[PDB]
Amino acid sequence: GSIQTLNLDITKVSYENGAPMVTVFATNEADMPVIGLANLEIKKALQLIPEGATGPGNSANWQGLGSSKSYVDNKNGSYTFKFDAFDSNKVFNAQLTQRFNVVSAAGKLADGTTVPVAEMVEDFDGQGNAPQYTKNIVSHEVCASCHVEGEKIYHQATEVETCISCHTQEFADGRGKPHVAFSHLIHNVHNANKAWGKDNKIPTVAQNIVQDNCQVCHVESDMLTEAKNWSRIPTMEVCSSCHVDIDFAAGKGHSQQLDNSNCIACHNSDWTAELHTAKTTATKNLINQYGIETTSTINTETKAATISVQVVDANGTAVDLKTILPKVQRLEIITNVGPNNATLGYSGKDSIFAIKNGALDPKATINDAGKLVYTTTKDLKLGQNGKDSDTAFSFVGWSMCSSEGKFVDCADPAFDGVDVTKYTGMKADLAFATLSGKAPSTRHVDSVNMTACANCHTAEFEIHKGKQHAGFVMTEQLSHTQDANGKAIVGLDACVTCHTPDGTYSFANRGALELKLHKKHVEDAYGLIGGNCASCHSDFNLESFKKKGALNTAAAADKTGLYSTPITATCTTCHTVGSQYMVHTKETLESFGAVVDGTKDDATSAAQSETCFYCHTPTVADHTKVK
Ligand code: HEC
Ligand code: HEC
Ligand code: HEC
Ligand code: HEC
Ligand code: HEC
Ligand code: HEC
Ligand code: HEC
Ligand code: HEC
Ligand code: HEC
Ligand code: HEC
Ligand SMILES: [Ca+2]
Ligand SMILES: [Ca+2]
Ligand SMILES: [Ca+2]
Ligand SMILES: [Ca+2]
Ligand SMILES: [Ca+2]
């Protein structure tokens, strides 16, 4: 017995007896009543002191009225709370909006049915009718873009409204700690200008992900009538969470301000909203000014691929590349072979910077039709490794020089790409070609896609922008299939051009794409992801292992490559053999057909000999499932 989702509604609030009597209705994912909840609670009862009541320009705030774990299970899905000690500070005011924060802890019903955590708030007027005014600024869904939904965020609770209901202005005042008011704390813990906590944690990682982008949490919504408060209510308490060097009382770094009465007179909402979003808006506008459309063909006699790139404008209209060439900062073409199991490796891939800082490489030209044309020079080895190897696949990344939201000429031929404020990575593309002339093979893209990456990195993620690459922006330009609803899938299959079964530049980095995203995020994003495979995966494509060969998993002492059979390679990125994270010894893994950090020849010969999926039946919901 398992409940997938526990829904909670406050269906009745009655003050006929003084202390409100509060009824909660609980249903499962099929809208059936849930009877026997043992850990239901009113975590907080609050009422809303309105905007400006504590002083001109001051925020609305939640005043505390108590809590209750005293309830009767009415045996029909409803539960009725009473308060043994309502409003112990005697501040109740029926003219104020009243809020109740209700939580149900994860656990089991008596019959043993598992029940997940549930949290909610609901607002009322002082007689239990609908409220007359609210403080609805954000909703819990924004946090779930980056923090695993249903798991605690730092501590105490899983939904932001529960945090807000405890981390109130009253709470902070009572502790003498302004910074623990939630509207200060929330920005503090994602911004690196000052540390937080007794251990003085500098939020370097949070800063690098959030980048002070107000729109990842402050989102327009008809559901949230105070959503524009992030620009409409400037206060020293909130604005100082990132602006940590101003002393408004002493007038250092800013004119003296003794209260919040005049902030809005100067910091008008238009300005605050615009200035904090200007650069991401400008960059997004530049990215969407141009596109590219790429084709590739194989010469059947020379077996080389010729890649042709058509620049287009925002409407899809052709743009002769000669007209914008002086502003093209880089354009790179990387070609590998065998999209389901790349065959050329990292050293054997074809790659060129066809353009650098306005200059065409001698190996690339612009034809009379205005297209860039380049022909591969490395041995593509087409058709030498089975049918999949009939297909070459080419990844095109490019960037354009830019300053303050405008494209500009690349005036410096030697510009090294380190200063990312001087250029914009643009929409990348992917082109297939076959030696036979038959339709190309393509890699599966049905298990991970860019929408998941964009939840944390935004859709404008300029992947690898810097000294080494132009920056790959991933979009429907390189989509070649749709999901069951007809939405174009933006895959990461182009990344395999470099993230090959042989690894990347070193054999020691688990560079194969099947390994690399796991390695980076289990090492550096575990606080956000943990074992939550759904953070990237809609499914696992276990059938894809039948198209895989050996995967590079280590470097030998002499720096040559060591390889594993592909399921073992994929699981061991997070489950290192010989570590506390892997119960199977090397010997046992070999008894299941695996090769573990052996030669490419041995791992290749044994690549379809692994018996792991006889026992293991992983799903995204539970990847640990075994028979
Ligand atoms: C992606 C753009 C995020 C959004 C949206 C939210 N959070 Fe966040 N948060 C993010 C990162 C990358 C980090 C650093 C993690 C690390 O391991 O260093 C954080 C950190 C926090 C913290 C600090 C404590 C911690 O768990 O590390 C808190 C308290 C926190 N985040 C809360 C939080 C809330 C309530 C959000 C919705 C309003 C929210 N975050 C959104 C990334 C992102
Ligand atoms: C009361 C029922 C709480 C709930 C709900 C939430 N938090 Fe909390 N938090 C609470 C206390 C008593 C404290 C210690 C405050 C102090 O005096 O130092 C905290 C502290 C934090 C912090 C540390 C802030 C800092 O040191 O600057 C963070 C980052 C934090 N809490 C986050 C947080 C989140 C994200 C919550 C909702 C998921 C949340 N808290 C709820 C009490 C309560
Ligand atoms: C998620 C990690 C956030 C980011 C990024 C930014 N804000 Fe935020 N803000 C967030 C929360 C959860 C809250 C509390 C809402 C509540 O109901 O209490 C806030 C609050 C503010 C406020 C206070 C508004 C008020 O009525 O007093 C302001 C002025 C504000 N936030 C501004 C702001 C700006 C300018 C940001 C980008 C630079 C920004 N926030 C980012 C969550 C997050
Ligand atoms: C962290 C999430 C922030 C919060 C909260 C607030 N601001 Fe901010 N501010 C932040 C950044 C990253 C920047 C630089 C933006 C850029 O692209 O250059 C700013 C900048 C300003 C400025 C202009 C700079 C100056 O020297 O004056 C102003 C006037 C400003 N911010 C005001 C402001 C107000 C009024 C805030 C509370 C509503 C506020 N900031 C919060 C980051 C963050
Ligand atoms: C008019 C007399 C103002 C009053 C009243 C308030 N602010 Fe201000 N502020 C004002 C200016 C002209 C600037 C510089 C703008 C620029 O782009 O250079 C600022 C700056 C700030 C900042 C940013 C600080 C920084 O990043 O260096 C913040 C966060 C800020 N101001 C907040 C703020 C608050 C909270 C106010 C009321 C207490 C307030 N300002 C009043 C002009 C004026
Ligand atoms: C939130 C749960 C994330 C998901 C979903 C994705 N990524 Fe991620 N990524 C995340 C964090 C916290 C970090 C560490 C950042 C730091 O400052 O240490 C990363 C790191 C990367 C990087 C490194 C480059 C960088 O800009 O930091 C890359 C190239 C990267 N992530 C790619 C990526 C891909 C392709 C994703 C979809 C499969 C993806 N990320 C999802 C957080 C999260
Ligand atoms: C060759 C031109 C590459 C392309 C195309 C892609 N990546 Fe890459 N990546 C490349 C190298 C040489 C390295 C360093 C060595 C290593 O294997 O770690 C990387 C690294 C990463 C990482 C690790 C974190 C980091 O260094 O940024 C990640 C998460 C990563 N690469 C992801 C990634 C994605 C999602 C790609 C397609 C959009 C992609 N890379 C393409 C070289 C090349
Ligand atoms: C984003 C940071 C990821 C998280 C979190 C997890 N996985 Fe993943 N996985 C990711 C990528 C980019 C790929 C490569 C896709 C490709 O084209 O090669 C994979 C691949 C797998 C596979 C192979 C089968 C497939 O669907 O392609 C497996 C079996 C797999 N991943 C398992 C897995 C598990 C069990 C995770 C939770 C512990 C998990 N992944 C998280 C990206 C990310
Ligand atoms: C990182 C992206 C992982 C990948 C790839 C795989 N697993 Fe995993 N696994 C991961 C975590 C973070 C955890 C939880 C560890 C904890 O104690 O919290 C697990 C756990 C398991 C388990 C259960 C633990 C045990 O001792 O058996 C199993 C059975 C398991 N994982 C299997 C498994 C398989 C078969 C994988 C390849 C298909 C695989 N995991 C990949 C993280 C990651
Ligand atoms: C049945 C005889 C199995 C075979 C065949 C394979 N595995 Fe297994 N595995 C099995 C069990 C009973 C467990 C423990 C489950 C638990 O919840 O305790 C595991 C565990 C793993 C793990 C997690 C290890 C850990 O977290 O310490 C991994 C990563 C794993 N197994 C991988 C794996 C591989 C790669 C296999 C084929 C070579 C394989 N298993 C086969 C049972 C069985
Ligand atoms: Ca209701
Ligand atoms: Ca909820
Ligand atoms: Ca901080
Ligand atoms: Ca295309
Ligand atoms: Ca077999």
Residue numbers in the entry: 44 to 670
Task: Give verbatim excerpts from the published study on this entry.
These processes evolved to allow the capture of electrons for anabolic reactions and the release of electrons from internal oxidation during anaerobic respiration. Thus, we investigated whether amber suppression in MR-1 could produce ncAA-containing MHCs and, specifically, variants of the MtrC protein, which contains ten c-type hemes. MtrC is found on the outer surface of MR-1 cells. MR-1 cells typically present MtrC tightly bound to the external face of the outer membrane spanning the MtrAB porin-cytochrome complex.
The structure of wtMtrC was inspected to identify surface residues that might be changed to ncAAs with limited effect on the MtrC structure. Thus, site-specific replacement of MtrC surface residues with BocK has no discernible impact on the protein structure. By contrast, there was no detectable FMN reduction for ΔmtrC/omcA MR-1 cells cultured in the absence of wtMtrC. Thus, our results indicate that MtrC344BocK and MtrC430BocK retain the structure and redox activity of wtMtrC. A crystal structure of the homologous MtrCAB complex purified from Shewanella baltica OS18542 shows that MtrC Domain III, which contains residues 344 and 430, makes no contribution to the binding with MtrAB.
